Design a protein around this ligand. Structure first.
Ligand SMILES: [Fe+3]
Ligand SMILES: [Fe+3]
Ligand SMILES: [Fe+3]
Ligand SMILES: [Fe+3]
Ligand SMILES: [O-]
Ligand SMILES: [O-]
Ligand SMILES: [O-]
Ligand SMILES: [O-]
Lengths: 202, 238, 238, 202, 238, 202, 238, 202
């Protein structure tokens, strides 16, 4: 048996290798990005945005974020999904973005995911899996984004219910807002301190 | 074969989040313990990237940004295998890399080091591992560089890498170093790793039989990801 | 103090002339043994070079040939002391150096290696040691390079040096390597040297306390030349 | 006590560092060269030239040569000369040159040296000390150049007389020729094989 | 010689600020990492103290506070050399010392230990190092004493010292112990120091050849401060 | 090469050895103190005062403080100052004090320093370098005191600008007050917790 | 997979041409160094031999020359695998062997040793390795024999072998010995090989589990040839 | 990684195993030999012959020689030939022979090879690769045979041009002779001494 290769921080320039356009490097013809909606993609379009804060309450302006999610019917565009259901064929389910160097805001254009089977016959509430990389972070931090308009499903969600300090479950619920026809979910992440966001070892 | 969950990440084989010798970690590490969960379809699935989208020079950092001439520096090939902890090859994984040029300078807005910029070097590449888990890319060996942790801190030469493979649980970003670099023993970022055998797992080895005469040297570097266990009784994943 | 002759060169501390593993030596080495002679004024005298003739950048290989910008590569300072075998400092000795650029390429008509040329690097310098025998120069760390001995031979990174000091008998040309370079153990030119402790005398050491923050690393390298014995009885030199 | 730093070959590019103009590198304002005659230098001007041959009888086209000699009165321009005589003040006594890359010829413009004291009251015949560096040569090879028009002094020279195989003494005698007013001494060096030049450990 | 900055303090050769075994450090240590800066004239300058202001007994703790008789306890001389990390002597540095008397009792308002006060002992002294960096003072060997960390904590015997030398960056306060004291292995303040070789750098050694017959014993104790690097290229300090 | 001697706390009685009068010990004729103004000293007299607080917000009543500063023209009374300017000859530039055992207040009578050259041609804003020693502090803590009436110079100061969390720069600015003709600068130091003072590794 | 050149032969893993202890080499070794060249199609190609031309007893030295009875001597099977230096099997390689009989006598005009000739033994065989690189042949164990190097020289028992495989560059002739033979430590031909680990690579090992009851013993002997590197960037071969 | 199995001399009886008929052993029905021309083989028939000499100038009477060559159109009868051209189907391209025990002469009946691609777009002059095995030779010696009637192609040949001592290139050129209708190329090999044949590490 082998031991996993150890993690090391992404460092301050994680953009060169992961978002070359943000670093103004044009080497690739196809670039990976924060837009998961293709023209024929099914579901309700939503915009997910927020900021990541350090222990002084200051936003990280060098953070890199990725999300992984199911399609509108809660099927993952992955060979490991064993549901036997057909997934939306115009959906990658993943995206990547970095925070603006000045303001610290980050965002994704995606679709609100459908509910996915939980373990042993349970049903999970709609959620987006999110990971954070940055200088100072030795191992990417995993979290989840749930939706405040899904109170009923959230209450029965297996993962939220496995967090014994109930007061912290709320750090994982994004707030719905309706900006000019666009349904936006605001999700701020607090790495340390009060209202520190729950992080998972998955 | 019916697959179950990924084996648990061994926290003792990785750096801790709070490591006061790496100063930036002091305000960017959670004070609460991570909450471990039992895996679901969300953690054992991951996206798929098609090779069709990749350009011919995406794994050739020597040529992919070359405009007027070749970049200055040591020509090297880096290759190896990606496997899971049970020894199975990791096929079609997305490997992305990025590094500084031969001066230790990154082509990044925020890098003002006096080491010279190279107009013919970009410093980023990507590849998909093949069916045997094998990957190979060509580049210029990066120079070490100074940074401000303590005022005179210097990182040993390194190449940053990222892997997106079969399961989200396997997601990993790290960096590898080069056999013999004396700065390896002084780096506070490498010392965040608890054990000596894990520090050594980040060192790429000189592969002399694979040097290409009158052309390039070669380093061998293998990567191990978390692996899934097979299920023979109850399958609780769903 | 009346000086007598230089102590005898210890042939066992140097490579032999004929070393078949370094192929070029096969036709360029005498078949007869060298003829040892007793020293005369011819062997114990040497020329003197005045500092007035030296330019301000003669010991700054980073700047002395820079035209449009800085050369690409790892900024390093090399310093140390020149002493004779009895530990006395060698003052005002002419130290000349030359090397390849960061690609392992020499600015020489005969070098056609594919490693890129750097328009801002020349690769040669010179200095006089001071009264303590101390020297210091700044440069770009050279890259290793391939050459044809066996077809895939590679020299470890090195800087060539020459010394003209107080006596013609002390005349010496050699080269120093950098601590940790893995090619040091495979080089047929370094293996021409018989003993391990003498191979180590050509390795420059990382001098971390002397690194300059956000600027340059530093290597320490001392050189020992033959020394003269003092005479207290008959002086036969003349 | 310390051991001498070990010698290593000069290698194929010994010109970059020792004769940058031959390598077409202009970095120094003052360049060292093969001309030892300054306008006020005393003595008879002579030109010393030849070729260096390897074991196949082929000339080395990458060799670097240096010579060290006394002035016209046999006094060295060196603080270690203990003769108590004033040396020619317009004489460095040293020069360096490389062989032409095409033909292999090398040459120096110098002065014929005066006789220098030998050990224990003896007198040495006029000579020029010479050293050879090149790819393939692990340690610079020391030799001496004596003059054929100094037969009488050569016969009594201590160093030539210490070579027990008398047939080899002649490899150290250069031949005088008078080319258009120029007195030239031809000295060819044979590193290996028949008529191999005597080399000294000094 | 043009001086540049002091070499970086090696944080690994010193105790960390937060050391929970020394309880008082828990609320008196910063939670943020120190911010390292590049040095300026402010950090490389320091005040100068003239010897004229020093009294004749300022380095004689045996006599400088003696009123009716001599203090009770073991007569000892402490001497040694102050050098910088590059081995250069530190000349005219202000060395100040303070300690408890032979009972382990300090002449301080806040010290209520039952060990007896000595009416003829004060416990403080000062000296300037000479041109060789040498210092010498005479005193009574202090007794170890109890203090409240855990309720039964005992410090080994020690003499507190402070140095103000050539640069503000060199400012240092520490304490030295005496060879053989068994409490050295149990002290939580000494255990705040990470490495065994650095713990040993605080132990003063018995110097038997320097004992004065029928009078006093002698301990040897050297102190090393940070040192400045010399500059041979750009001088950015100003 | 040698390793620096390791630091150890000053301990609770740091006064015996460093301020014997505060410990009521009269052994020295000349005593070092917190008054840097001599009668002929040039510049504006200012009083610097404050308290040092621990993590519970309680003042340290056993702390020892020292400051190091330039004269009114920003020249240091030190042989290492390379400005080539004449320094005020009636200025030591250093002083030492301890906090009152009851209240925890400390103070110095000094002069407002002139601006000092920064690196590479820059100019530093007026500042006083300060170090703190006390039981519980294993290594003296270095900080700097800048002045709130020097907003313009502070904004361009190299060291303040090298602190990336801009919110913390303010912990280094003392507040000017004009008490009965005396210009006083209040500087409180918070070792741990909210508004923790920036400390430097110099 | 696009193949590039064979890795360079490591001259240090082979005997030198001039080895004065093996007297015949003195006049049959070049005085010039070999000239290394970059490989072309000429060096990476080799002929192909079809199995159809091989007889049924070509790998059975016990039976292939037997006329009236069986040859006298120890019945042994020799088998093993041929691989390249990267561990890949060498398929369909021509393996040819030849040896002396049980007396140490060769069936050769020039062999006049008094050891007896065996009318039923020839001493030569051949085989093609299979797809796994495996070969197997049967023979009589050869006896050691005397020869004139020094007058009383004796070779340990051995079987000569030759391989023609995929590339001309792989062409190799050598000989293997048998585990335990005491003459192995005295042979001047085996001592021409520089390192002990390479001398051991010529020793065939007793393979007890593969002995055939009441019939034959068995030795295991693997052979490693030079291997080709794969190309992922420029293919300069043509 | 594994180290290559070390070479050992072929020894004096290399014939038993490699040319059993020369040793008078009849064990094989199909015997490998020195005739590379089959009835339908294409190209000009040539005979290649010579002797191999040791350092005393005496011929080796126990040497074994093999050659490897391309067909008349310069295509190798080998699966590793990547030219994409059809090779002569009645051509093995390899042969083996031993020198006559009395005279030392060896010979092959073959075909003059066509020119083969060199590296990087170059063209090699027609050549035959040859290897020598014998008692006293620890590792088979590789050489090449070029043809004197191909002066123009030889002059541009990459391998001959990579031999820096130009005087030695001629040792690799065989001499054409026309004996009674047979075109014979005489190639003598000198292992040591004057006019020593160039040997390659391939
Ligand atoms: Fe980096
Ligand atoms: Fe070189
Ligand atoms: Fe104490
Ligand atoms: Fe044999
Ligand atoms: O980085
Ligand atoms: O070189
Ligand atoms: O204390
Ligand atoms: O044999």
């Amino acid at each position: 048996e082998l031991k996993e290769t150890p993690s090391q921080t992404g460092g301050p320039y994680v953009h060169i290798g992961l978002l070359p356009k943000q670093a103004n490097i044009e080497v690739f013809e196809h670039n990976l990005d924060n837009n998961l909606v293709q023209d024929n993609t099914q579901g309700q379009r939503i915009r997910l945005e927020g900021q990541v804060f350090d222990g002084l309450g200051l936003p990280l302006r060098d953070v890199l974020i990725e999300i992984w999610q199911a399609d509108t019917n809660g099927v993952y565009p992955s060979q490991a999904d064993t549901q036997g259901k057909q997934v939306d064929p115009n959906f990658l389910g993943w995206g990547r973005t970095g925070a603006d160097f000045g303001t610290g805001f980050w965002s994704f254009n995606t679709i609100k995911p459908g509910a996915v089977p939980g373990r042993k016959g349970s049903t999970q509430a709609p959620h987006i899996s999110l990971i954070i990389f940055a200088r100072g972070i030795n191992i990417g931090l995993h979290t989840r984004v749930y939706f405040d308009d899904e109170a009923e499903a959230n209450a029965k969600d297996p993962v939220l219910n496995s967090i014994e300090w109930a007061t912290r479950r709320q750090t994982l619920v994004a707030k719905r807002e309706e900006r000019d026809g666009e349904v936006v979910y605001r999700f701020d992440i607090r790495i340390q301190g009060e209202n520190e966001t729950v992080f998972f070892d998955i | 074969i019916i697959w179950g969950a990924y084996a648990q990440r061994n926290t003792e084989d990785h750096p801790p989040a709070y490591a006061p010798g790496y100063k930036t970690s002091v305000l960017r590490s959670p004070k609460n313990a991570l909450i471990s969960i039992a895996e679901t379809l969300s953690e054992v699935t991951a996206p798929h990237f098609s090779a069709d989208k990749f350009g011919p020079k995406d794994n050739d950092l020597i040529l992919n940004y070359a405009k007027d001439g070749l970049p200055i520096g040591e020509r090297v090939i880096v290759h190896g295998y990606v496997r899971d902890q049970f020894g199975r090859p990791v096929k079609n994984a997305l490997v992305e890399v990025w590094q500084a040029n031969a001066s230790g300078r990154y082509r990044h807005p925020n890098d003002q080091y006096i080491g010279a910029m190279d107009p013919n070097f970009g410093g980023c590449g990507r590849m998909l591992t093949d069916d045997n888990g094998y990957y190979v890319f060509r580049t210029i060996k990066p120079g070490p560089y100074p940074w401000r942790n303590r005022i005179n801190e210097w990182s040993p030469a390194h190449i940053h890498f990222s892997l997106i493979a079969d399961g989200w649980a396997q997601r990993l970003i790290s960096q590898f170093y080069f056999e013999g670099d004396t700065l390896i023993d002084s780096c506070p970022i490498l010392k965040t790793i608890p054990s000596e055998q894990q520090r050594r797992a980040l060192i790429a080895l000189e592969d002399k039989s694979n040097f290409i005469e009158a052309d390039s040297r070669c380093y061998r570097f293998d990567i191990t990801l978390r692996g899934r266990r097979a299920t023979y009784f109850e399958n609780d994943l769903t």
